[PDB]
Design a protein around this ligand. Structure first.
Ligand SMILES: Nc1ncnc2c1ncn2[C@@H]1O[C@H](C[C@@H](N)CC[C@H](N)C(=O)O)[C@@H](O)[C@H]1O
Ligand SMILES: CNCCCC[C@H](N)C(=O)O
Length: 423
C-alpha cells in the first residue's frame, strides 16, 4: 500500500488499538485515504477505539512540555502549536501519524490567487479571506509571544504555511460534538451523503460506530454535518455536495446609527431577540427565516409609521412588524432586497448556464468546487429576488396596520341614540 501508511498501521497495532475485532483496514480511495471493511460490518457495529492516551486536544497539550506556556492561550491556538511542535520531534508519539497527514486539502484556505478568481463575487471568497487574515494575525502574535521567547521548546522556525497547515488539519479532522479532539485512527473515515443519522462519537477511549451496514471491500463513511451549507463544507473540508438543498447565502441586516429612529428601533429589536446587526441564512428551497421580514420592516420603518415606536405599542410592535406596516414600508424593503440581489448577481463572472455546462465535463476538484458554489449562490440569489418580485405584485393583498385597525369599527351597529336619551 504505502511505506508511510503500512508503517502507520504497524504503530496502531503496537498500541493495542487495532486488535482482531477491528473489521477495517486503510486504502487509497478517491477521497484520499479511508477505512475499508475487511469483513462485513453492521449498523452501529464498533469499528475502532483509540485510547485517550493518543488524543491531541487541549488536555493533551496542557500536559506536555509546552503545557505551561500555552496556559492562557485559546484552545485552538494551543493545539496549533502542539501539532507543529510534535510534527518536528523525531521522538514524537505520533511520528508515524504525521507521516500520513496530507500536507494540504482543497479547503479554500490553500487556493492560489488564480484558483480564488473562480469564486469572484461569491460570499465564499469573502468568508475565506476574512478567516485567512484572522488566523494570520492570531498566529503571528503567537510567534512573538510563545515561539520566539521559548526558543528552547521550539528549536526550528515557524512559517505561516505551517500555521495554516495545523489550522486546516484542525478544522477538517477534529471532532466537534462530544471539545476540539483529534484521533489518529478515526481521522481517516471520510464523509458520504449516504449517511443521514449523524452521531458516531462515544466514550478512556474514542468509540467510533459505523452508522451503516458496509459489505466487505467497501468503505466505511459518516456524516460530517447535515446543517452546513456547501460554502461551509468547502471551507472546513475541501468538498461540496451536488445536493441543491446545501446551497445557502446569508443576508446581513442592521439598524444603522444614522437612522433618525435608531434608539427606539434597537430597543424594539433587542426586546425581541435581535441585535443591532443580524445575520439570516437563506438556504435554497427553504422558506424565509422567521424574523427576516419583521426586521426588514423595522429597518425600513420611516417617519410616517414611526408612531409604532411609542411606548403604547412596545408590547405588540413585533406582532405588527410580522403582519406588515404599510404599503410604503413594504414596497421600500422589497426594492431594497431586489436591488441587492441584482447588484450581487452582477458581481459574478459567469452565468448559471456557463456554470452548468462546465459541470457537464471533467473539472479539477478546486474548480469543481468553485463552479458548484457560485452556481448555488446564484440560485439562492435568484430565488430570493423572485420571492420579493411576487411580493411586489401582491403588494395590495396585504392588510397593513391602518386597515387592520378599522376592521373592528362597528359602523353598522344599532341606533345608539335611542338608549342615549333613556338616561
Ligand atoms: N466526501 C468526500 N469527498 C472528498 N473528500 C473527502 C470526503 N470526505 C472526506 N474527504 C477528505 O478527507 C479529509 C478530512 C479527514 N476527515 C479524512 C482524511 C483523508 N481521508 C486523508 O486521506 O487524509 C479532507 O481533506 C477531505 O479532502
Ligand atoms: C475525521 N474527520 C472528522 C469530521 C468531523 C465532523 C464533525 N465536526 C463532527 O463532529 O461530526
Amino acid at each position: 500500500l504505502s511505506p508511510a501508511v503500512q508503517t502507520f498501521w504497524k504503530w496502531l497495532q503496537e498500541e493495542g488499538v487495532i486488535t482482531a475485532k477491528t473489521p477495517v483496514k486503510a486504502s487509497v480511495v478517491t477521497e484520499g485515504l479511508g477505512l475499508v471493511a475487511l469483513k462485513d460490518i453492521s449498523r452501529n457495529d464498533v469499528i475502532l477505539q483509540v485510547p485517550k492516551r493518543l488524543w491531541i486536544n487541549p488536555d493533551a497539550v496542557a500536559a506536555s512540555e509546552i503545557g505551561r506556556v500555552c496556559s492562557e492561550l485559546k484552545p485552538w491556538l494551543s493545539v496549533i502549536l502542539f501539532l507543529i511542535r510534535e510534527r518536528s520531534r523525531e521522538d514524537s508519539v505520533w511520528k508515524h501519524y504525521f507521516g500520513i497527514l496530507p500536507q494540504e486539502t482543497d479547503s479554500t484556505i490553500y487556493w492560489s490567487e488564480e484558483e480564488l478568481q473562480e469564486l469572484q463575487g461569491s460570499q465564499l471568497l469573502k468568508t475565506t479571506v476574512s478567516v485567512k487574515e484572522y488566523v494570520k494575525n492570531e498566529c503571528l502574535k503567537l510567534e512573538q509571544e510563545i515561539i520566539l521567547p521559548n526558543k528552547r521548546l521550539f528549536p526550528d522556525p515557524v512559517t505561516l504555511d505551517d500555521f495554516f497547515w495545523a489550522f486546516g488539519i484542525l478544522r477538517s479532522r477534529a471532532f466537534s460534538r462530544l471539545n476540539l479532539v483529534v484521533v489518529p485512527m478515526a481521522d481517516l473515515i471520510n464523509h458520504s451523503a449516504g449517511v443521514t443519522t449523524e452521531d458516531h462519537a462515544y466514550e478512556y477511549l474514542f468509540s467510533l460506530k459505523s452508522p451503516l451496514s458496509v459489505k466487505a471491500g467497501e468503505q466505511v463513511y459518516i456524516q460530517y454535518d447535515l446543517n452546513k451549507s456547501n460554502a461551509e463544507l468547502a471551507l472546513d473540508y475541501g468538498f461540496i455536495e451536488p445536493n441543491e438543498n446545501r446551497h445557502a447565502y446569508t443576508l446581513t441586516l442592521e439598524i444603522s446609527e444614522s437612522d433618525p429612529f435608531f434608539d427606539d428601533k434597537l430597543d424594539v429589536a433587542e426586546s425581541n431577540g435581535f441585535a443591532q446587526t443580524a445575520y439570516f441564512d437563506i438556504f435554497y428551497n427553504r422558506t424565509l427565516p422567521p424574523g427576516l421580514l419583521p426586521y426588514l420592516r423595522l429597518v425600513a420603518l420611516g417617519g410616517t409609521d414611526a408612531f409604532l415606536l411609542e411606548s403604547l405599542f412596545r408590547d405588540t410592535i413585533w406582532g405588527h412588524l410580522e403582519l406588515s406596516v404599510s404599503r410604503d414600508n413594504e414596497e421600500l424593503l422589497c426594492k431594497a432586497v431586489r436591488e441587492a440581489c441584482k447588484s450581487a448577481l452582477a458581481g459574478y463572472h459567469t452565468t448559471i448556464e456557463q456554470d452548468r455546462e462546465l459541470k457537464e465535463g471533467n473539472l479539477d476538484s478546486r474548480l469543481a468546487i468553485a463552479v458548484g458554489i457560485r452556481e448555488g449562490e446564484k440560485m439562492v440569489l435568484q430565488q430570493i429576488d423572485g420571492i420579493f418580485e411576487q411580493k411586489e405584485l401582491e403588494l395590495d393583498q396585504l392588510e397593513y396596520y391602518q386597515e387592520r385597525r378599522l376592521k373592528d369599527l362597528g359602523l353598522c351597529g344599532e341606533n345608539g341614540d335611542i338608549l342615549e336619551n333613556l338616561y
